[PDB]
Amino acid sequence: MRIVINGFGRIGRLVLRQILKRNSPIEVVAINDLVAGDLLTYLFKYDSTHGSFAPQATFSDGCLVMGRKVHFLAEKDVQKLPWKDLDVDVVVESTGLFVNRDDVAKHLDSGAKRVLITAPAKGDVPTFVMGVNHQQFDPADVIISNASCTTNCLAPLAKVLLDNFGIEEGLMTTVHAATATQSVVDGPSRKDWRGGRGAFQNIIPASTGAAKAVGLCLPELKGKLTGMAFRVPVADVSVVDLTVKLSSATTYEAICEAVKHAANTSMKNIMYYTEEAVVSSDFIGCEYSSVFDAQAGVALNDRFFKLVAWYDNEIGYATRIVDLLEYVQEN
Amino acid sequence: MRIVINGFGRIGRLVLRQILKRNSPIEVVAINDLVAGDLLTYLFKYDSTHGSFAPQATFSDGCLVMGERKVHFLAEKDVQKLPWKDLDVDVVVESTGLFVNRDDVAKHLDSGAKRVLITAPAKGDVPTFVMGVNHQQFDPADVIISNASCTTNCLAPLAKVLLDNFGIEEGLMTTVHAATATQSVVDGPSRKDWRGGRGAFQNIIPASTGAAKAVGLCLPELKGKLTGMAFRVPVADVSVVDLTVKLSSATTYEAICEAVKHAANTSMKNIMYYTEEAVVSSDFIGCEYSSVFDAQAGVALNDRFFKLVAWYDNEIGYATRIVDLLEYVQENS
Amino acid sequence: MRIVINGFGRIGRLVLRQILKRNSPIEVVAINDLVAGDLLTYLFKYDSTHGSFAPQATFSDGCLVMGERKVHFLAEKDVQKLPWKDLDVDVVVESTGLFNRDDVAKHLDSGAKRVLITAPAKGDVPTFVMGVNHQQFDPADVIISNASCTTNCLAPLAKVLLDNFGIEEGLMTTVHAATATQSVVDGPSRKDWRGGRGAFQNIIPASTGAAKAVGLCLPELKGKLTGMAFRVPVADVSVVDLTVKLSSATTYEAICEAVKHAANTSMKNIMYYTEEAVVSSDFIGCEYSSVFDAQAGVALNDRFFKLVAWYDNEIGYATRIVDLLEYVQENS
Amino acid sequence: MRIVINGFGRIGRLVLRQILKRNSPIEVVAINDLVAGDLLTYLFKYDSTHGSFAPQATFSDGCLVMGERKVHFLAEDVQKLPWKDLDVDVVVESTGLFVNRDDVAKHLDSGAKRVLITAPAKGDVPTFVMGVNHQQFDPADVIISNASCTTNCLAPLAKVLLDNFGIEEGLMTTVHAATATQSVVDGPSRKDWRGGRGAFQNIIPASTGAAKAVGLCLPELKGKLTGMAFRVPVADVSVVDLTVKLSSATTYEAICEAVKHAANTSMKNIMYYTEEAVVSSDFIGCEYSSVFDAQAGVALNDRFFKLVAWYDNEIGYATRIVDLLEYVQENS
Ligand SMILES: NC(=O)c1ccc[n+]([C@@H]2O[C@H](COP(=O)([O-])OP(=O)(O)OC[C@H]3O[C@@H](n4cnc5c(N)ncnc54)[C@H](O)[C@@H]3O)[C@@H](O)[C@H]2O)c1
């Protein structure tokens, strides 16, 4: 399977890393970004959050060399990308700028067979969450979205609850790590004023569509969930706090058993169940979409619960991108 | 009224700061801590969070000298050895964080204090008060009282406004809370909450809180109707309450905003504040309100299920409430 | 004096703040930035580091409105379309961090009387530091530089040392607060790879010209100083660590006395002298260029010393910008 | 060799981690600390800085059980520690409380053969730095010190410089990660007022004796070095900034070549040499004592240089403790 990575940021680089951390047919043929390949190679090899990687990797003549040679490109506009000539099966669209189906289809015009957007999409782009609705994928879907890190944490938990107890209504908060859209010192962020305030000085409220996005993958939950976020000063790992009213009376123990059973069966490699006294740093490098924290949750009564689920918003999501690439593509 | 401050920490020092900032008639006779007065004076004058204060203050002859105020320093870890009889102490501000059971705190009364105000939730038959919510329930017979927690002081005024206007069926609260002195700079042991010892500025840290049940203490109509939890995160001050509430009456988000705004203009004056600005935690450093409703941050699922957001400076807002409660006790005992 | 502010970032906003905190005869007539005025007004009023300011300020009628002060917001990217002629602009405060004298002269082409660059300049730009060489300013200098925060901290101390003891050689480190050029998580920084690594996860080495730049305002020190920086996870306040070999034998105590006397006299309101157990947060809002930390320094012998001087790299520098503006207004 | 760990903090736990990581013949027979063993086991298995370790490890019957390793947990006053019953060859003294020789000798009174203090000591305690002077260890040395993290970073660099060029004088700064002596919010620290100010809000000046301890390990350098520290808001990894006046003229490149050569030969596994654009987080888990940062340093002239060397003050130091224990095991 021949892929390119457009946008070599946190997600693009860690997608490459996670590809290298498994046995996979994926062939990464090119990387496109706005800076030179020697700097991109440096950022791939040295990671403040996830530590060093690929010590033998080198840059030479615009190629990332690992044994594997990946072309580096630095071409601002899609019409100029050589996807036909590179025989590209999938573009990993990870710049964070192209979420419109019109902007992203220009990857297909320049010769790519499929595009995977590493973010919520604008418009009705088919959106998949592994372990929740990925079996709805149709080969005719030439532009697809892997949703957000937060939706990938919430949707599996919501599915377990829907399948065992029913959901009447839910309101989610994610206490979320700082991300590249934020600023080191107070600065302007036109489309999110709060998001420009100093990222490590502040708890910063943010809007999020991740809870509503669960209705895209679990149609029964459309209109039944919404939420918000607080951005906080950690560099990685986030947590979903789901306040949910269930459709039937249950106990906290029954919820734990339902989640533990799903993690052992239908949610294997997607959800994990823990009773340990965990904190955010314990999930750095965690590849699960959703880690249910049994000790942290609380029950008000037999229908009203507050549940806690962790996610490495960088590595868990990058791993899911790779899982979706392997699932959708042929050969 | 003659008070002493036992434990000259974040809360003890900022209680003194707020006493001085309103030129209060309270007499701070003595300060007790585990270290000498020169170091304590240094900490009172220089504050990483709230800036320098009282530049003319000096440590002199074992006292803190600030104008006409001269406060004796003590360094006696044992409550049974404190000279409260000899100092004619009306109220001990108990802010060490070590004495939480009512019988531990009563030791101050054995050593000669007339009354104790614990700057924290207490266990046992301790009345717990929140200014603007139930403080007029104070009785001169209450010789040991609690000002609850910072979080309870943020949630209870909001909970009262909702109860009075719409009714509350059930509520589940989270507080995203600043790191505090119970935490550690690097991974270390915390006997009562293992997670709480993990490096404070490396982690989002789940924690238990009793603030939701305590609202049921201040507002008996809400007994059994609220619970919640906390996440400690890497900021040095200011915290936020995230209240997911099912109301008894159908309403709109805008009507909730108007109810809070009206309360902040009337029955909750100086306790709750209402904003529509694009605020972040640092905007509340030095904020003296108990609860600042963040109108733009909240979300509505439907006409009865809402997520409401309220900020609090867990240091300065709470310290200001301590001074408010002290002056109230002074006027009603 | 009629000024405009080009670039409303940390420096631009805090220069406006300091002008207003000292209710100065400088008249601020316009702000140019490529962000809308409602957001810029928000950032001016709410500051994570320095607290809220000007609560009565509003964005209204395309202006920043504060009492009788009304400031036009502009969003003009080409320096020739700037209406400095019609606005009768005496000084452009150039604080974008993007503008090499050839580019900056175009402000005068569009009608401004003089330009003040809030950073080190390349080319034939006079460089001034208040309290060290700001009297070299000549009305014929239509483009001038206020140097860097770090140069404004090091040069006053260096002048006191040169005048009392002489300097043979010095090597400086500044342990510097994070700045807007840095990144929240690992990202690319073309001319400074380390500078793109997560700002609050790392101690980050950086190059600095501040020490060599001290030779501009103190020619006696040309070739005698260099240095480097470590960027660390604080949002503001930085500290100079100067290892210096002096030209005569002295004691640490005598160095403290030279600095204290200068802070009481020729360096008044420029340098400050403390013996308190200070830490960086104690200088948030500090307006001095350089605060000598008497307790922190060490002496190896009678000629070789390590001296420590603090500076609020935001507020101290902004205050020096305002001071230089007022000096330029009184002698122009 | 049978050892116990007194004080199961950052150093104590990571010493145990490094023993297990290299499947070492050292036998850890007991751990003493002031908290229960299930909490200590949790802290050993989950580490915010260095990640999880020993997933199969468990607390059982008052012991830490890891395979065949069964480590007694104690929670005890040095007077009643059961070193006689445990047949203890070495106490790893890692509490940070016992630094003077007579306090530490109470370990020998309670039955231990030898004590290794994981800190600079007070009194006639021989101090060793692996790769610098550890072969001076004598079996008669029943109380020894491994110096500090900082000394283990500075001394190898200083030895390379001394052997190749000579050192006339040096002033060192370490920009140091926050440690367990510091506080989350402003609190009292009797022996260091600045050290109690909020650790992640501040750059915090601190005293250090590491430069003078290098004179202990390299007597040729006694009196020629001193220095200071800044504590800054990172949870691990520190850097030495050494301003040095060498006795012979050289070039920066020749310094780089001398260090690179030492790292390949006499300092193998002690010093590392890099030319990469590194930042502090790149050294989390680094086991070397001193990592020379070739790109970061600067030269004023052919005798006066600023050299930069990194160290994981937790893991590098812990690894050196294990190295010294194995050396003592082979020479006692
Ligand atoms: N970081 C997370 O936790 C996370 C989680 C889930 C989803 N995502 C999504 O992944 C996407 C990328 O996020 P990120 O965290 O990697 O951000 P990032 O800023 O780290 O990465 C973006 C990269 O793309 C490059 N780029 C920008 N414009 C470009 C262009 N025109 N052409 C090519 N390259 C360009 C940037 O220089 C940068 O290297 C976003 O859409 C984000 O919403 C991120």
Ligand SMILES: NC(=O)c1ccc[n+]([C@@H]2O[C@H](COP(=O)([O-])OP(=O)(O)OC[C@H]3O[C@@H](n4cnc5c(N)ncnc54)[C@H](O)[C@@H]3O)[C@@H](O)[C@H]2O)c1
């Ligand atoms: N920080 C907040 O946000 C906050 C808010 C509300 C309530 N409180 C509560 O107030 C109390 C104090 O909290 P803090 O944050 O100020 O803690 P702190 O650690 O800052 O202050 C405690 C002080 O007590 C001193 N002390 C300890 N043992 C002592 C003893 N035996 N005798 C005398 N002094 C002693 C310590 O040296 C320290 O100065 C706790 O009960 C805490 O729960 C704190």
Ligand SMILES: NC(=O)c1ccc[n+]([C@@H]2O[C@H](COP(=O)([O-])OP(=O)(O)OC[C@H]3O[C@@H](n4cnc5c(N)ncnc54)[C@H](O)[C@@H]3O)[C@@H](O)[C@H]2O)c1
């Ligand atoms: N952290 C570093 O970077 C570093 C580096 C080199 C050397 N050191 C030195 O190593 C020593 C330990 O430092 P640390 O960082 O591990 O500190 P720490 O605080 O993390 O560890 C000390 C441990 O000892 C325990 N303890 C306290 N009093 C005790 C007693 N009387 N009996 C038994 N156990 C007791 C504490 O509960 C704690 O777990 C200190 O001398 C320190 O200077 C630290």
